[PDB]
Amino acid sequence: PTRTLVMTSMPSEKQNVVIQVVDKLKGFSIAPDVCETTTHVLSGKPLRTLNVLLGIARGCWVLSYDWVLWSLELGHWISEEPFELSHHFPAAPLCRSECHLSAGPYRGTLFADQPVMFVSPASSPPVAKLCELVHLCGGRVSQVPRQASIVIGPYSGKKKATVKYLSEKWVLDSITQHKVCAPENYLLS
């Protein structure tokens, strides 16, 4: 399909402008959520939303709204890099670069050396999205805890000495920094 652009943390007035500029310059379809066709995520205020996180996981451009303003002014979609939100999200340019250099379809390898994980059904952010993030960044998620050495999110079941019980933020901070953060900083009781 046509590449998609996703807005996040975008106030109403700014959404209007983005929609109008895309209608003028073409080249994109606006989607509500980051998905496999998404190449650009535009943020109105640099907050770590799920769309930002999925954007990083997929190696999208994660950009300030000003990219749209200057593209309008100059009459075409201009270079993205000057507007990339690398100060807030260090991994953004790293995954974006990896993705653009990938021969086959891009998939991150951040969690490739981690053991099997199980994500709590009660996780925050929501389990389906959190599992997607782990998978996109090279991790392995089992649908049952029996096989997992890492359990992420709320867990009131029987705990084992052979398992690490971590918060969801271990996953998110790792993705944001492009490095596996220390698990002991994220112990969840």
């Binding site: 996040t8 943390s9 907050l47 770590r48 939303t49 799920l50 769309n51 996180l53 925050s124 952010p125 969801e168 933020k169 998110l172």
Partner: peptide, 4 residues
């Protein structure tokens, strides 16, 4: 959208 929630910030996480």
């Amino acid at each position: 959208s929630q910030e996480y």
